[model samples]
Target: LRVVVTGIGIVSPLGCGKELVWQRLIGGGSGLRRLGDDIAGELSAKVGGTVQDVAEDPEGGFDPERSVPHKELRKMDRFIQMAMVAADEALAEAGWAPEAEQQRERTATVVASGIGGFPGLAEAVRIGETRGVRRLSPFTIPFFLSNLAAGQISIKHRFRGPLGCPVTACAASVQAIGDAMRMIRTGEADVVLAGGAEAAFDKVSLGGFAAARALSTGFSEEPVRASRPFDRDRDGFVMGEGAAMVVVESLDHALARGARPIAEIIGYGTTADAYHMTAGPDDGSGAMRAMKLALRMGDVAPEQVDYVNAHATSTPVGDAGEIEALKTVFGVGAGPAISSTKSATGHLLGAAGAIEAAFSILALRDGVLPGTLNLEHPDPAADGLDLIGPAARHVPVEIALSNGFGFGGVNASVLFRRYPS
Candidate 1:
């Protein structure tokens, strides 16, 4: 019942498709940027990590209209649109489209989203208020559904296996990937399309996060430095939008189908803080449990983890808890190095873990480590760990851990090991 990742795909602020995204990220490119005057002129959170010049991306682009015609684009929310694009690439890469009816029936999907369709929902509400109930789009209900990612993916591939869309805020995607692995281990399915997508950029989301004090507002002029996770000068995270997907299959299933693995998913764990609604305690009890459980599941020693893709969101409180938790799980003299991809792509909410997980695989594949950008001043408390910073560094990486912590006190950690040729 061993599960492994056969394919990886991503659409992010850094760029579209895995190649460009991985290239720019390791090249030390910063994806954060200032929004248009029309979007920023009325908001305090003026900066964001967003995809620029979509068509210019070498992998073509992230234009939903390209994949789905304009006539049909109205049927889905932006989140679902992004998820489908990612799924297409991942499935193609894995060679797991499963034309056989039975094969498709045995496959499962778990695409998650924290804020499913905030923009669509807001627009629907406003249209209803201003132009009467008749003005509402008939597709509104299905379009805004958080579970639509799973539903649409299953429908596209004709998959009729177990499907779920667990929404635990930011940890949603990591949970999706982890849960899919566990499901495959239990013989629930042979293949799983697992990941998440988020498209939460809009006036309501920005203003709401700003009001909750969860967004970076002081670095609008320096948008590139707005998401400095674990940096001493970081105030908060700049929201970003993106999607990521992985074709996860049982090791036996993958080999039987002659599909080579990109990486082996050895561990999957998730836990809850039960601490605060929006923050973990300074001691990081919950985060500690999540990481510890993941390591134990993988039966990997703390010292064996040579790298960590941290879930540092640039928030003062969130970053501290994650660092403390890593120290607890890996020990004070841990050899593993760490970095936060969030520093480059901003916070992707539920999709952060999936994109970061893809980056982790790429890091292992390339034998290079991505550094935490804008980390000019590292927190003294995290001095015990080797934080990858200043710039991207080439290094030997055997196994890596990716973290995900959400607002509801939920947390997830997944362990990935290098694939053997």
Candidate 2:
């Protein structure tokens, strides 16, 4: 079963809708700004990609009431709420709403997140400390579990098929999407809502990453320049929050339904390093395996690929490892253009893959490649690769690959081909 993307939706720091974010992205805009006390404070990397005044959007920004009834909003956490918003947007864009007949059969949702509900967790802890165990919210378990995003989406959409969540840190969304593709290919389901959501801009989350020194700190005076991937003076990745989703259906099913295909999911690859818990493998062999598998599955020659949306988070070691991985898989100039959007959006963490995949598809659809903002100087390691920078490039795109690697050595790569129809 071949899978095709019919719709894409996102709630990024850039804004509430996909078009707004894409416009800024294609125009070389940066969403990395200083964090306020409401999210993160006093951290070394005080800048982040945060959705501003989301409450202004319907149902308190990610309000389930907009998609579901008002009664349901009380049951979900912020992350799950965001997932609902994104999923609703995707389904609406695809003109899909589960009818009673379809609801009886099989539909699925695969929504993953690195940290499920930080706000809920923090609140639960506070409640426990202040009012004792008895005061814990009845929905605490359902809200905090990492799988709740998938569960909530499944319930709201009335999906009766396989629903699962992949919690591979930053690679969570890619893994979820990959799993959904496999399910369709294996004749498990006809349609799936696949994506990732993350809202971890809390004190604990920021404090933890800050302690690990995995965040950017050098450009506090100029926050937009903090996340410069493949740049000589790159410091580290800035934390970001967002949700990205896509409505994926079997190619045959989509055609039968008269749905327009945006891009075909030609290949998916995933691997783990088993070498470290917090860092990628030094030689990037695991990352190489993912790219090689994706290319092989795609049956696309290395040179035929037109672009690569890299998972470079601007962290020194991770950036270097990705470069090594690209060299190993593409053989230094065998592939095509490559750039990291994290230089603009910061690190969306588990949601990065889904958001970047959407960006790649948009690039193919529009024939415009967005640049890596604030890339004043290129890294020597990325000398040969064409890192689109400063200004967006108008280029014809046919095939593209998106890469995502996470802590615990998890890696995922996906290959997409423009639907020639």
Candidate 3:
């Protein structure tokens, strides 16, 4: 049950759609920018990869009527709306429309989010406080559940099979995708709409991260420099919001449907540290295990991997832990070309793995590798790896790995192979 990607979609701080986001990513454009005065005053991290001009639509501008009915738009949260937009783009690109019989039992969706409907939840709380509990909207529970993204996507697309939502903190999206792949491999489904979305740009979320000292504070004056992963002066990650999605189908199913193959998902590895609630193991034992498991499952030697999308996050401890894990698993100087795109997109949190996986597939297809923006100097502690920085490079990529580590010590690593004849 080999799985292949047929279509990809993304909405990121770099841009609104997959085309713009990929262009900026491979063109080496930085997405992080200075925060507004109000947002800056609320949190110590005054810079973030805030989506610019996102109020406008990427598809023919903001014609809400074209994408969704105005009446329905008013009911969905921004995160769910973004998921809808991305799903439309991806499914359209796949040129796939399931027959009524197939739609009933062969198609599924696995949309994930780390913190779903935060904005809506806050609004509900506000309404309850101001107007009393009886004034709360009837849609409050439906809109605020973390699984609503998956449910809404399934309903909108008429997919009735295996709808699920992974909420593993930062690794939610990747886990969702991984589970979808297994479903296809085991013949549980033929196609899976899988990815993650997050919108947590509110005061409470921002202030919480700031309190934990998990956000960048030194680059308010130069916002683009805030998320400097693996750099000597790196402080902490910058926040970001976005959605990334891909249409995956079994190899035979995709070919039978005449769908263009983007790449093949070859391997998946997931592990838990069981050592901490908010932090990874100090020695990166969990990270090493996950990477090793992915490589083993892929049946590829460590030296054969051409690129690695690291989950460095620019945090002091987490970055060091990942580097140490790489060394332990791949041996010193054994890993592939590595860069943390979070240096530009900030921490998309749960969506980071999906977005980065899309970037990896595109890198293999386009023969161009994106760089780690804002990494001016490599950290002395993280040594013996080729870290692409601040500039795109021309490279022939055949195989790649994307690593993600989340809170509660959940770690995931996936291997992707370029499609071959």
Measured by TM-score, the strongest candidate is: 1
Write one digit per residue (lDDT tens) for candidate 3, span 331-372.
655568888899879998878878988988888888777888
Q: What is the lDDT of residue 233 in candidate 3?
A: 85
- Name the regions of candidate 3 deviating beyond 4 angstroms: 54-66
How many residue pairs collide in each prediction? 0, 0, 0
User: lDDT rank, highest first?
Assistant: 1, 2, 3
lDDT of 2 by residue, 147-200 (tens): 888787787667888888888888889888888899888888888889999988
lDDT of 1 by residue, 1-421 (tens): 7789999888888877898789888888888989766556677788888865555565536787655678877888888888888888888899987888888878999988889888789888888889988877778899889888788878877888889897888899999999889889888988999999998888777878888988888888778989999999888888998899999988888999999999999898899988788988897888889888999999998999988999899999889998888888877765689999999999999899899899898888888889999999999889988898858889878899999999889999999999972
The Cα error of candidate 1 at residue 280, in Å, is 0.9
Candidate 2 deviation (Cα RMSD): 2.1
**TM-score, cand. 1 vs. native:** 0.97
TM-score of each: 0.97, 0.95, 0.96
Each prediction's RMSD over C-alphas, in Å, is 1.4, 2.1, 1.8
